[PDB]
């Protein structure tokens, strides 16, 4: 009688970390710390 | 519900009367429906004015 599941390994508790890992690399950019940014109100912005 | 009149008469002495029961009509008026219907985009519902 051990850990193995159909020698009593049947008995212990199962745990769990309900936190998710981010897996993703992303993306880091700066170009909106310098360029111009401006609020729009119809669907066409024109200069 | 609706009916008539009846229809008395000039009647001699010891003359018997006649039947003059109505005769009764139910007017029926069925209920229908009508409808309208226009959609809109998400883009023109906050762009537009």
């Given at each position: 009688m051990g850990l193995t599941?159909?020698?009593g390994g049947y008995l212990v508790p199962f745990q769990l970390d309900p936190t998710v890992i981010i897996?993703?690399?992303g993306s880091l950019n700066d170009i909106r710390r310098f360029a111009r940014?401006?609020?729009a109100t119809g669907d066409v912005?024109?200069? | 519900v609706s009916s008539a009149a009846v229809q008395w008469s000039w009647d001699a002495e010891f003359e018997e009367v006649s039947d003059?029961?109505?005769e009764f009509g139910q007017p029926e008026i069925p209920v229908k429906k009508a409808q309208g219907f226009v959609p809109i985009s998400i883009e023109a519902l906050q762009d537009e004015a």
């Open positions: 599941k159909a020698d897996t993703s690399n940014q401006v609020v912005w024109h200069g | 003059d029961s109505p």
